[PDB]
Structures are given as structure tokens and as C-alpha cells.
Design an enzyme around this catalytic site. Structure first.
Site, short mmCIF file in Angstrom:
data_model
loop_
_atom_site.label_atom_id
_atom_site.label_comp_id
_atom_site.label_asym_id
_atom_site.label_seq_id
_atom_site.Cartn_x
_atom_site.Cartn_y
_atom_site.Cartn_z
N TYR A 63 33.73 44.60 39.27
CA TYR A 63 33.68 43.64 40.38
C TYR A 63 32.24 43.18 40.59
O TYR A 63 31.36 43.96 40.98
CB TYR A 63 34.28 44.27 41.64
CG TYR A 63 34.20 43.51 42.95
CD1 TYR A 63 34.10 42.13 43.01
CD2 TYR A 63 34.20 44.21 44.16
CE1 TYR A 63 34.04 41.47 44.22
CE2 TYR A 63 34.14 43.57 45.37
CZ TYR A 63 34.04 42.18 45.39
OH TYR A 63 33.98 41.55 46.61
N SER B 156 35.91 44.34 49.52
CA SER B 156 35.05 43.71 50.49
C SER B 156 35.88 43.25 51.68
O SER B 156 35.56 43.55 52.85
CB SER B 156 34.29 42.54 49.86
OG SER B 156 33.41 42.98 48.82
N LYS C 276 36.58 41.02 37.97
CA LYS C 276 36.67 40.21 39.19
C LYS C 276 35.34 39.53 39.36
O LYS C 276 34.32 40.19 39.66
CB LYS C 276 37.00 41.07 40.41
CG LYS C 276 37.22 40.25 41.68
CD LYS C 276 37.46 41.10 42.93
CE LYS C 276 37.38 40.24 44.19
NZ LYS C 276 37.46 41.15 45.37
#
Lengths: 298, 298, 298, 298
Positions: free
Chosen positions: D139, D49, D167
Site C-alpha cells: 500500500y 486509512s 494499492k
């Protein structure tokens, strides 16, 4: 804020016991007050969400405040949650809390109807006036209230004259730290029991919680561990609390707590008020076992 | 559902007037009921959200129900909103609505505390029993209640014995159509005034709304126009309603409506109850003009 | 807005056919373009959400735009959805749409990362520049985009130089009316097919939708029925559309549509791209029967 | 999970430098890799990101992965964020990460279009296959992805063959504790920098974050402090991090970070890609002073 430091600590959000007809069970209320005192709890937060305030009349909430003060005044700290949607109703309860010799009042941000921030502030000012000298604990619970204050709004609220604390029932631990950073002296209660250790680390200096009725000493233990830099003990305690909270979330929290207290010989009849239903009977063995464990641990 | 057909129509969600001390203004309440009757409303929905129920005691709500029935029983349809968070409190109000000769009861899905779907169903069943023959209007307003029923859950609720209608305060007009499709005979009230015409087209067969206190005949005009295939007239009327609603959202809807009614010589003192504050004076020119327009239109 | 008047109408959001290797199936693309033309669709919206834009490369999206223009330019209106998160990528697609002779470009509000309102405005300005004279259709889909523009913001966006329409994929029909009221000349496409009739009544003057690929004639029929004051016909058509939409939501909408088109002999392989999975085998009989029903209807 | 232990630690979410023409700035990329190595970072999470993945082409993302491996392979741990909405695109990136000698791959839950849990699972399975032995870091970032997995779903995902870590970019520290409790050996990265200390206390055993590019030593400091039982130092470090994060949120986080790095002589041109705009000029003095303070600190 500084002059209200004596409000710092670990305070159980008191349940309200009912009898089989769903009326107040006064004997179980008194027992539960004494049980909390004997546990070494710092104080009681009375007539909050956990106390089923919003399914009680004003007279019923008054009766509870009166009895709790009879049992506990001068022994532990007492905070009366007086909040209603109505300002005037909240004021009535604040005046009663004062009459009964509580140490502080508290009010949830009024809910259901949307109100402007200024309206929220006037509500608190009015209740503070009626409390005639008792400090106010602002109570923020966005998940249930539907009220979405900004940080700047929170900062304004907690600095109104007469506000001495914030009960922050929010899992946003960035905001928890930001509030501590803005208000170094503010009494700041962690409201979600399942993040207590992490809330203290972020800046809370105590807590108010429903599960403290059955295991408040664990939260006290977390405070001590962290102060002493004993992180492993703080973590292990929080893990044990969360194992219990997983169960209570399955059972329903208030009724699961009442049921544990039933098996601890505190609560005669472990019902919440309708429309809450009963605990699924399948959970009774586990809840019995938990009561047994906690009694051996205590 | 077929048996409660006569509940179909356009019903104003009655406002509750207060005096300067915030007590019930009985004279303005009676005038407001007569004004609604005189302008041709099909019925009144009393003690709802718009009625400021949730900042009134049970006794206060009963006093309003009693006075409205004195003024209106047998002249227009009367639906008592009896809903509280507590089932027992709601049952008290249902019994009172029956004693005063109301045509139906209604209850918002109980709010604040999360309840299971089964709990919601048992709540309605208890209230229906206490209403002793008066049909129940289930009231769904997810934006304020926090209750998020599925379509299948709505279907189960509206087919409970004794349920004769749904007040659907939702802007989801797919769901409106799905409800009509499942329940061809159900009385289905559109709850958001600013989508009334679109709600009817989706399947609602009437409405309950706050703005009907001042311009209910426009909504009746929309019903007629759609029935007659006059889409332009319906859209025009809806546009005029929404110009008014834009203003009322800016002013605060209940107090804005009370203020229009004040300038129409109906409501003596246009206050809502604390923590609602007064209307900002900057809006008075528009509210005054609207009053003038509506008097010359009706 | 007046200048772009000729974009008004009912435009299918074209599906992008793939084969079993997940490659573009250009022969099925051409067949689907011709199938839509024959429904009497006003136009096609190419490479949108329904067109699986966000699981294709820029090259793939260009290849599809070029082929659709070859098949349909001058016969029906063509809108190229050029939107990407990246402004530069969106610009590349806009330049290509101009080269291929599209009538307009369109871009979803860029998603995933939060952008300020000014940033959104600059993104549209930049794409409009690259479109080199093609009007822009702003595409608002809050449920998927995460972008929550206020009405004032929408108003500023749709009045940027070069903007000729809004594709409003929102179920808020108050806002639909407010948009129409502020912008009497704006082309305003209803984006949720399951509220099409109610959306037109609120103020939309056309629509862009996924289900138009299999039954676009029904939506044109609703436009016509409303104009002619035949409200029951409009309602019955919307009801039939919603029966189909119930099924497509169960099956997965894009893949259900592709499967219907497969049974109609239009699309060779009814797959969406991974991570979309295939249609559950248990739904194939219903989809085949639906294809047969729709073929008989037309 | 035990076999991915070597992935535990504090990994910076690497920014991707661009120039004024919005092209990759490869020279600044190498400088930024080396700068991170010198801070003592345990590893880099590349093309996430923070790396502006979703405004780059696959070719661009691959070019970045290749250069980072040239600069850093064998010196620090390297995790390639290969996630796209498309499974096939994600697989291409995973195969490239393998060729370049990364230590692990990672993929955001695919976003925009709603996918079923089964679809999410199959997406991860396919990327793992293409990663050809490299462990997968799931994630989770619900705020941006729109994906709302249940705890049971997360448990299934993180126990798929080939998954070595999670994550967790979520502020729900109850869930953080639940995940640790269920998976005692799982590598669990805290994703929100502004709650890092509290996240570790709840059970994270490391972190991946954007702000580590400019003050990663601070986060390593917090890990060390908690390990030693030095709660005060950990809190003080988190407070300092949060003072910085307040500023970065004001300025815009990625561009603010790039701007600090510019003033530290690392990044030539501190721009993000459109539709991100530039930093407001009014904030530049604060960002320069911040860069100066961090340079003096380290």
C-alpha cells in the site's frame, strides 16, 4: 469559450532547431513545420517551453514566429506562446504574433519572482489587449513555473475576457475533471503527453505536446479511438507513446526529439541551447531505430 | 579562495529604479548608488534578483552595470550579477562587466528548465571564461531557482577554477556550517537578511542583501558586535532588522524598499516592473515612518 | 509563559533502550538516565521521537515514564512526551505522567491524517485537561509530522491556557526570532542540534535534542559561551557537534547514538525497533572511536 | 502475480464505526459490512486509512477484523490492512488476519520516521512471513506516508515473494501505466476515487476506496462501461462520483461518509475519533439530501 472551439485539437509544441553555432537553423525550422503539416497535426504551438523560448531573445522568438506563419498560416492552426516573466516583453511578442497572423496567443504564468493572483490576472489582461483580438490560451505548468493556483483561481483566469483555452500541463486528473465540469465549452489541452488518454477521459478535449513532433498521429488516434469507444486501441497507443517517452526522459526530452527528427531528415543538427548539453552518444542506435520505426509507421 | 579575500563584506543587492513609464530611471539609479556609497556599504551586487534582472533585457542590464561602474568603480567593491538561463546570454553580460571594470561576476544557478549537475558546472565554467579574470560568485537560491544541489555538488561548484565566493540564499544553517567547515577560506555571503546574525555565527563571513539599501550599516554593526563578543548588541540589531523585514514581506520587498527610498528622497518613482503591482496604500504610513527613522539613524 | 520559566534549559531527548528480542531494557534505561544526569543536563524529554515513541505501545511508554521518574524526579526536570495521533491515547499518557510526578507534558502535532487548525487546538486543550496542572510543551516538527502551521497559528497554539513552552524542531531561524519577538517570556527549545548555537542567537533559550545523550555537556557549553560573549568557543563547540552529527546521519542517528552509548558501557544492546535495521558493520570502528573520544573529553 | 488474480476488483475501504464515547460500535460495523455486501462490492479492505487504523489500538483493530470475517468470510473478498509503523505490531495483526481467515493482508509503507528502501523491504518480508500464506497487498500513499519510493524501488517491492498486489494511492497516471507495463499480471488497485476511470484507463484493474461505502455500484458501473467500450457512461459516472467527492472534501471525507451512512440508517453515530472533529452543522442538509438521492438511485 464557445466561440473559440476552432482551437480544439492536437497541436504540436514546436521545437526550435539550432545550427552548430547555436543560432537559429531556419531551413530545419521550415522543414519541421512542413513535416508537422504532412503528419496531419491540427496546429502548432510556437515558442513554448518545448521551443526553448526561455533561452531565446525577444528578437529570436519573433524570427521563429514569423517563419512559422510564413510556412503554415492558413494551413493549420497557429498559437504563439508569447509569455515572458515581464509583462511588457510578453506584450511585444503578442503584438508580433498579431502582425504575423497567428490564430491565438498563449502565456505561461510568469515565473521566478512570486506574484499575487491579481498580478497574474493583470498580466494576462495586458497581453490580451496587445494581442488585439487573438484569443488567449492560459498556460499552467506548476512543476516548472512554481506558481500554485487554486482551482477557484484557475476558474477566474480562464474566464477573463479574451481567454479561449487552457493548456493544462498537470498530472492532477481530478482537477482536469473539475475544470471540465465548471467550463463545459472550454478548450482544454492536456499538457503531459504520457497521460494523454487518461487526460482526455477526465475531460481534456485535445492536447499540446512536445512528442507530437515525431508521433502526433498517435495522439490523433487516441482521440478517435476514445470517441468511437475503442478503448483497447486507445490504451495500446498510449502504451506505445509511453515506451517512447521513457526513452526520451532518459535522453533528455527536447534533445532526444531533435535527434529522432535528425534521423527523419528534418533537423540538421540536433542540439539544444546551452546550458543543455548533447545527447549521450550511447542513445544514438535506439534513437535511430525509433526514427526508422516511426517513418515506417507514418 | 584565499586570493579573493578582498570580496569579503556586506554588499547591498542594488535595486533598479524605474520611471513612470517603467523605463530605467537613470537619475534615481545614480542617486541610489551615491546614497549607498555615502552610508558606507562595502560594495554593490548589481543586476541580481533584487535588481529585477529577470524582467530586463540584456541591453538594459548592461546599461545599469555601466552606470553603476561610472558612479562607483574604485570607491566600493562591484559585483555584476550576469546570470541568465542561457549560458551565451550570461557570457555576454560577463564580458560587459569586465569592460566596465567590475571586481567580480556572479550567476544564479540557471532555472526553469531542469539541468544536470554537469550542465550547471559547464555553465559556470563558460561564464568564468568570459569574465576573463574577474572572480565568480556562485549564487544559490533554491526557493526561487528550483535547483536542489547536494552539499557535495555545492563543494564541486565552489572549487571550480575562478570561483571566489558563494552567495548562499538558504536558511539551512547546518549546510552553512558544513560549507564553512569544508572551505575555511571561502568568501561566504549570507543571502537571507532575516537570519544574518545566525548565518554569520554558522560560518558566513558577510552578506549580500536587498534591505542593505536602506539599513546596511545595521548588518555591518552585527559583524562588528559578533567579532567583539557582544551578543546582545548583535541580537538587538537583528531584531530591528526583522521588524523591518516583517513589514517588507507584507508590502512586497523590492517595492517596499523602493518606497522607503522614495521617502528618503533617493528614488523618484518607487515602482517595480510589471507584473509586479504598486504597493498597497495602506502600508505607506509605516514605510514613511521607517524612512524618517532611518534618516535620523544614519 | 512566565509561570513556566523553570522549564528553560537544555534537555536530552532520551533514547529508549531495547534488547535483542526488542523488549524494553529497563536496566539500560536506568543507566542512561543516570549517565545524562552526570553530564549536567537540565532535564530529560521522555518518549519523544528520539525515544521511539511511535513504535511502542501505550503500556511500554508508561513503563518508561514511570522508571525515569523513579530515577530522576526532583533531581532534574522531566518532560513526558505523551503525544499520539489519537487524542484519547495522548490523554491516557498525560494522566500517567501526572501520576508519576513529571514537571510537564508534551505532544507532537498529531500526524498522518490532515487535521484542521481548530482540531489541533482542541487536541492540545484535551491533553492539557488530562495533564491536570502539568504545563504543556507544544512540539512542532514539520519535516516528519506533515503539519504546516502558519506563524499566526503557532502563536495561537502557544498561548492556549496551560501551554508553557514550544519545542521547535525547525531550521527556519527567521521564524525562531519571530516567535521570540511575539512571546518574550516563552520557553523556546531549539530542536535541531546541528544549528543549536544559531538557534539560541535567533531567540531560542534552550534545546531538546537527541545527541545530548552522548555530548550534552557541549550544548550547555554553547549556552554558557554565548552568554559570556565567547563567540569563538561557541562556534568551535557547534563545529565539533556537527562533525559528530555528520557521522550520525551517515550511520542512522538513533542507532548510532545507541551504539556510542553501548561502547561507553551504558546501553547493553544498541538496537532500535524494526523497521529500523542495525548499524552497518563498516561504521562500527568510527562509532567506537567516537565513544572513546567522548569518554576522554569527559 | 498470476496466482493472486482472484484479488482483482473493486473493494471498499471499510469505515470503522464509533460511538459518542469514541468506543467501537460493533452493531453499526456489522450493518456496514452487510450494506456493502448488498451493493455488490467485490470485497472489503479493513482497518485501512479510511478505517481510522492509526487512531486505534491493536486490540481494537483485531476486534474489527474478527467481526468483519464473521459477517463476510466466503461471501466477498477480505483484505486485512495490518500496517503499523512498527514491524512487530504489523506482524501481530497479520497473524490475527490469518487466524480469522482473511484472503490477503496489506500494509502501508511505514511512516513518520524515515526508513531506507532495504528497511521497507525487510518490513514487508517479515509481515508476509507472519501472514503465513496470505498474499500481501503493498500500500503506497505518498501524500500521507512521506515515503517517496522510485519506480525501480516499487518494482522490487511488488515482486517480493508473497506480494500479490499493489494499492496505488497516487495521482501519477504515468507511473500507473509504467507499473502495468512492467507487471502485466499484477493486481493494481487505483486508490484515489476521484480519478478512478482515468486510473483504470492507465492500467489499474480495480480499486480500493473510501467512497465505495456509499456508492460502490457507481465504480462497478465504470469498470463495466470501460470494458464494453462505453466511454460516455464511464465519464458520466466519474463526474457524478466527483460531484460527491467535492462535497465530502468540503465536509471532511470519512466523517462525511459516516454521516451519509447515518442518514441511510446504517451507522448509529457518524463520528470519527479525536482529533477529528464533527461535521459542521451547516453541511448536514447537503449530506442528508445526498443520502436521499443515493437511496433513490439504488
Amino acid at each position: 469559450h464557445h466561440h473559440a472551439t476552432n482551437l480544439r485539437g492536437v497541436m504540436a509544441a514546436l521545437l526550435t532547431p539550432f545550427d552548430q553555432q547555436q543560432a537559429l537553423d531556419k531551413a530545419s525550422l521550415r522543414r519541421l513545420v512542413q513535416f508537422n503539416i504532412q503528419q496531419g497535426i491540427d496546429g502548432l504551438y510556437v515558442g513554448g517551453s518545448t521551443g526553448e523560448a526561455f533561452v531565446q531573445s525577444l528578437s529570436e522568438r519573433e524570427q521563429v514566429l514569423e517563419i512559422v506563419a510564413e510556412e503554415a498560416k492558413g494551413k493549420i492552426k497557429l498559437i504563439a506562446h508569447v509569455g515572458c516573466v515581464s509583462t511588457a516583453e510578453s506584450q511585444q511578442l503578442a503584438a508580433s504574433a498579431k502582425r504575423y497572423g497567428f490564430d491565438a496567443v498563449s502565456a505561461v504564468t510568469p515565473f521566478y519572482y512570486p506574484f499575487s493572483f491579481e498580478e497574474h490576472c493583470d498580466h494576462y489582461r495586458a497581453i490580451i489587449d496587445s494581442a488585439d483580438g487573438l484569443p488567449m490560451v492560459v498556460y499552467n505548468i506548476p512543476a516548472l513555473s512554481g506558481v500554485k493556483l487554486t482551482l477557484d483561481q484557475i476558474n477566474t483566469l480562464v474566464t477573463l475576457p479574451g481567454v479561449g483555452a487552457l493548456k493544462q500541463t498537470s498530472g492532477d486528473l481530478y482537477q482536469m475533471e473539475q475544470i471540465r465540469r465548471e467550463h463545459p465549452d472550454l478548450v482544454l489541452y492536456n499538457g503531459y503527453d504520457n497521460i494523454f488518454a487518461s487526460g482526455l477521459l477526465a475531460g481534456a478535449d485535445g492536447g499540446i505536446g512536445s512528442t507530437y513532433n515525431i508521433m502526433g498521429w498517435r495522439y490523433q488516434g487516441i482521440v478517435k479511438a476514445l470517441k468511437e469507444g475503442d478503448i483497447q486501441t486507445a490504451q495500446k497507443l498510449q502504451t506505445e507513446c509511453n515506451k517512447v517517452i521513457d526513452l526520451l526522459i532518459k535522453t533528455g526530452v527536447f534533445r532526444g526529439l531533435k535527434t529522432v527528427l535528425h534521423y527523419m531528415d528534418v533537423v540538421s543538427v540536433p542540439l539544444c541551447r546551452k546550458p543543455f548539453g548533447p545527447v549521450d552518444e550511447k542513445y544514438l542506435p535506439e534513437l535511430k531505430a525509433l526514427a526508422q520505426q516511426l517513418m515506417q509507421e507514418r
